[PDB]
Design a protein around this ligand. Structure first.
Ligand SMILES: Nc1ncnc2c1ncn2[C@@H]1O[C@H](COP(=O)(O)OP(=O)(O)O)[C@@H](O)[C@H]1O
Ligand SMILES: Nc1ncnc2c1ncn2[C@@H]1O[C@H](COP(=O)(O)OP(=O)(O)O)[C@@H](O)[C@H]1O
Ligand SMILES: [Mg+2]
Lengths: 167, 341, 192, 100, 192, 139, 55, 44
């Protein structure tokens, strides 16, 4: 509801700059975390895409990058940055990129802390560097620019073991 | 073109596969359903039918691949396979999971409709359990629907150049593997927990059927002890166990099949005007040989070929010969089949 | 000094003790003289098996020359109290306490090897002090003797008076002879 | 919050994409009704909690109970409806195939 | 101190004791005097090997100055009970019980070293107490001697009477003499 | 190379033999095709073996791969070792019977002569690659 | 570098030789080619198979 | 963290406020932040 309102009020004529509130879904296994995301798209009227954090890695590595998330959103938004800048995202398995009690920072956890350090500006807002092309667009150097300061980013995980930490 | 009833599918599968009667029924109805839905996109309602994956937990040299291969060949659909031990998570040198989709598209001949009706066959699922876990986490999504990004190339510059998507919620994922040790795990849950001692049950009577009946009683909890994460098991509702090829089976396995090794030589020798026979005693010796090397039925091709190599080198150099009767001593290499013309 | 072994499974490799590895299979070894420390330790093994699975049989291999009476009777109450069936195996030697713990096993699950020896005798004791104190201990040990024979006769199926004569003095019995008395149900010689 | 036995029973009937509605729609393709006794659903829920499989295990449980039924169903005729019951899930009986 | 060794395998490298390493290879060491604690330990090892492979041979190296007779009969029953063949090798010294366990191996798998020593004699024992108890113990040990000699004659092949005459006193025999008596099947001098 | 690469493709070889056949399908149908340099691409490249599945099954006027016999030379690198991991058996530390030939060799060519299909996959080969090679000639 | 990439191609080696040969095919095919630093293209990668070793 | 507090505090309020009608003002108080009380609605 709040998101939809921001869209109708995207002109933001009022001097204030309305922010966004990102959600963090925590639930036991087999409870329906990834189900609610698939069920919301059935009624949404705006581009929505799903992803997984077990395939993401820091920049400059063989794995995936955090900017791929915005590429999937354009496939669903007919490569319309304006529409893509007012869509919702759902990052599944956000609990598998958590440091394995490596508080001393022994090595670089490109699959854990490394991925978290790359999203700190995507959830807040920054001029993301979209991958060269994943659509009709033929060139690659274009490096389409997009702003993520009005793009909701949901993150869900199972956090197996957090129940003990709480107790 | 009304799909064939499971009975027909079983009767056909029986022709090329002797035994594993329970698994045949499972893989007949399970796939008859997986396709009855795809041919009817709508359901005269707002329901969204799901997918049911098949888990083939069988012993080595049991023919899990054969069943999958034969099931696809009986029909006209694409078929691909893989090996879990040759895959790894992202960031590592190991082949990425997306690579599997490439092979599927290659076999599909640059088509989506066909590819959507394909049956991939993962193998060697075991040995990548806990203590890896990361590799089992990625596959957890692929088997339950994923809009993957596959490079559109390999089909002579595919007109589509937008990282062509493929829905993975309609592909039958027949994930197999030889779970070495599960038989013991199950026995500790369904019978006496004594494996060592005077009152335990040592498996030394060549009771190859024991494992088959044991695996039939497998439950998801049994798999958790093996290492398999609960979520992965949940994605595979259907489970079909395969028995262990017995000595009688081996002799039988190359008797009935239309593509039996014995019949194969009969066809080519008949083209030259000479007959070929295989005394049952010879077959009994062959069976023991395969168990001595534990090469299932893969090594039967080398046994008979080696035993008939010399023979083939002399038959075209002879005349008036119209019959051959292989004896038990022919295979060991101490005799040559008599030529009675 | 004690050799170690590994149990290979899908999870990985784990090093286990030779005696500990068998405990996983519900197997307990009763070796050496009976005492409070070894007897209490055996009881812990019995309870642990009950916690894991109260429905699976427990195997007890006995090899002892006898010992304290109080320590031995502690095990008897532990085997009969818990639900699981306890299988007793006589190996090499079984004295008054070792044999008492042998016939106390589950019916139809008491085995003994052919080259095994079993001895039974009345309990032993003693006390030094005042006369009135000796009468108390002398009267107490008599109850133990009669109480123990009542259990031996019940599990064996023999009569109390007949058992008293047999246990009046040291009575050595072989494996086949043991079956006649009723201490055991069968003899294990070869597999199947 | 973790799902409960009651929640599992509701998931089998209320959701638009419930297993019952899915398998029932499948049986309608061949012109035969598929009925599920409410008492049977309670058995399945208990099984799932005993197997620690959650909602995903429900499909596995039902498949094992309806495997043989669908093996001969498409090859026969004059079968108007089937009535699954708790005994089928236990494996001590066979589903009755009403004829008509 | 017992040193450690590394075993390279598919999963990686695993550390084992020198005795544990040989246990993985179906080899058991029988060192020192024969007592209940050592015998029960060897029995657990033998049964453990049966589970891994009930069809493969087991190697038992015997080097002992002797021990209690009850312990030996416990191990002898185990060899006859378990299906896999047990190969007995005598290295160094072998006394009455060591020799009895040496000839109890699988027929055709009994080896002996050229400078190995084998000693055989009748059982030893004793008892102090009343005459009635001495008579009981006297008949008990007498039965053991007859039971042991009967088994010794079966594996060796010699007549029962010959075993009695030769076992009246300590009898020392070398590797070649063992073959003639039948206590062993072959002599190992050099590989191949 | 891969079917999507720029370098030599599997279709290229089909063309090579087409020229020798004089644009006669009958000639190119049976004509032997010996594949050389097959011992360097061997899975340690990895992508080549995947790019060969099509050529194994047989996927201008297209010429069907009806009977164009395929051969390979020196493909494996350490096959001998793989074979011993499935044929050589016995015991380790022990006396007499127990094998004591862990640093001694008997023959190298004999191992290759007794190669089994299992050993092939055991080195990293794929089922279809060897699935269409029902014969083996040991040099 | 391998053919296609932005780096030089082995084909240019012959071009250099032609300059010395004065574009004379005969003299060109009778020249000598000294390839220095041949020990620098001894591939050290641990079988990645994702990309190629252009050097 | 402040955004979390305001969202959680007004989470329920936003779920039912749009459905309601004839409402002009809303006043939040310290007790609403603890959960003991509910934010009142100035109908009219
Ligand atoms: N509350 C629920 N209502 C209906 N179905 C559910 C519910 N929770 C789980 N499921 C079932 O579980 C599957 C999805 O599980 P998933 O959301 O991946 O579990 P988790 O979120 O714990 O990983 C679906 O097939 C769905 O039918
Ligand atoms: N019933 C059977 N009939 C014919 N061949 C069989 C049968 N069972 C097994 N096989 C043989 O097994 C081989 C395939 O097994 P494989 O794919 O190696 O199983 P896995 O990969 O699970 O070990 C085939 O070559 C096939 O000939
Ligand atoms: Mg989920």
């Amino acid at each position: 509801y709040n998101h939809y309102k921001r869209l109708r009020n995207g002109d933001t004529s009022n001097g204030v700059e309305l922010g966004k509130s990102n959600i963090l879904l925590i639930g036991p296994t087999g409870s329906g975390k990834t189900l609610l995301a698939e069920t919301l798209a059935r009624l949404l009227d705006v581009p929505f895409t799903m992803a997984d954090a077990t395939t993401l890695t820091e920049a400059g590595y063989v794995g995936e990058d955090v900017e791929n998330i915005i590429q999937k959103l354009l496939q669903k938004s007919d490569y319309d940055v304006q529409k893509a800048q007012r869509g919702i995202v759902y990052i599944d398995e956000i609990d598998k990129i958590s440091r394995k009690s490596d508080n001393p920072s022994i090595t670089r956890d490109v699959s854990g802390e490394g991925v978290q350090q790359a999203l700190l500006k995507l959830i807040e807002g920054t001029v993301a560097a979209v991958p060269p092309q994943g659509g009709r667009k033929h060139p690659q150097q274009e490096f389409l620019q997009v702003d993520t300061s009005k793009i909701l980013f949901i993150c869900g995980g199972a956090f197996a073991g957090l129940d003990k930490v709480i107790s | 073109s009304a799909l064939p009833t499971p009975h027909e599918i079983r009767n056909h599968l029986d022709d090329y596969v002797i035994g594993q009667e329970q698994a045949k029924k499972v893989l007949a109805v399970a796939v008859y359903n997986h396709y009855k839905r795809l041919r009817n996109g709508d359901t005269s309602n707002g329901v969204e039918l799901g997918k049911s994956n098949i888990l083939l937990i069988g012993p080595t040299g049991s023919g899990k691949t054969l069943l999958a291969e034969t099931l696809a060949r009986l029909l006209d659909v694409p078929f691909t396979m893989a090996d879990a031990t040759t895959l790894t998570e992202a960031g590592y040198v190991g082949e990425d999971v997306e690579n599997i989709i490439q092979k599927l598209l290659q076999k599909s001949d640059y088509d989506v409709q066909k590819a959507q009706r394909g049956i991939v066959y993962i193998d060697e699922i075991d040995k990548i359990s806990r203590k890896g876990e990361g590799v089992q986490q990625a596959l957890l999504k692929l088997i339950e629907g994923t809009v993957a990004a596959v490079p559109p190339q390999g089909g002579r510059k595919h007109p589509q150049q937008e990282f062509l998507q493929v829905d993975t919620s309609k592909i039958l994922f027949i994930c197999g593997g030889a779970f070495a040790g599960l038989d013991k795990v199950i026995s500790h849950r369904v019978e006496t927990g004594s494996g060592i001692g005077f009152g335990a049950t040592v498996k030394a009577k060549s009771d190859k059927a024991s494992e088959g009946e044991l695996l039939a009683q497998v439950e998801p909890e049994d798999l958790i002890k093996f290492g398999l994460i609960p979520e992965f098991i949940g994605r595979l509702p259907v489970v079909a166990t395969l028995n262990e090829l017995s000595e009688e089976a081996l002799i039988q396995i190359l008797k009935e099949p239309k593509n039996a090794l014995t019949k194969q030589y009969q066809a080519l020798f008949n083209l030259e005007g000479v007959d070929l026979e295989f005394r049952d005693e010879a077959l009994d010796a062959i069976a023991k040989k395969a168990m001595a090397r534990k090469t299932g039925a893969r090594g039967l091709r080398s046994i008979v070929e080696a035993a008939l190599l010399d023979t083939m080198y002399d038959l075209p150099s002879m005349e008036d010969v119209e019959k051959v009767v292989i004896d038990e001593s022919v295979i060991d290499g101490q005799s040559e089949p008599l030529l009675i013309y | 000094l004690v050799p170690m072994v590994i149990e290979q499974t899908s999870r990985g490799e784990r090093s286990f003790d030779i005696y500990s590895r068998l405990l996983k299979e519900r197997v307990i070894f009763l070796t050496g003289q009976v005492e409070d420390h070894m007897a209490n330790l055996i009881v812990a093994q019995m309870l642990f098996l009950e916690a894991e699975n109260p429905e699976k049989d427990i195997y007890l291999y006995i090899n002892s020359p006898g010992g304290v009476i109080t320590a031995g009777m502690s095990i008897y109450d532990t085997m009969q109290f818990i639900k699981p069936d306890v299988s007793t195996i006589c190996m090499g030697q079984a004295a008054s306490m070792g044999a008492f713990l042998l016939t106390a096993g589950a019916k139809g699950k008491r085995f003994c090897l052919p080259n095994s020896r079993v001895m039974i005798h009345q309990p032993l004791g003693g006390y030094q002090g005042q006369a009135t104190d000796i009468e108390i201990h002398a009267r107490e040990i008599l109850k133990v003797k009669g109480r123990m024979n009542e259990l031996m006769a019940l599990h064996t199926g023999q009569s109390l008076e007949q058992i008293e004569r047999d246990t009046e003095r040291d009575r050595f019995l072989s494996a086949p002879e043991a079956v006649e008395y009723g201490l055991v149900d069968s003899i294990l010689t070869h597999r199947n | 919050n973790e799902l409960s036995e009651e929640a599992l029973i509701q998931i089998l009937k209320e959701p638009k994409n419930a297993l019952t509605k899915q398998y029932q729609a499948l049986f309608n393709l061949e012109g035969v009704d598929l009925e599920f006794r409410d008492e049977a659903l309670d058995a399945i829920a208990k099984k799932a909690m005993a197997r620690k499989t959650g909602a995903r295990g429900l499909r596995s449980i039902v498949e094992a109970a309806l495997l043989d039924t669908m093996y001969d169903l498409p090859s026969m005729e004059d079968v108007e409806k089937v009535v699954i019951d708790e005994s089928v899930i236990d494996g001590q009986s066979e589903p009755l195939l009403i004829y008509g």
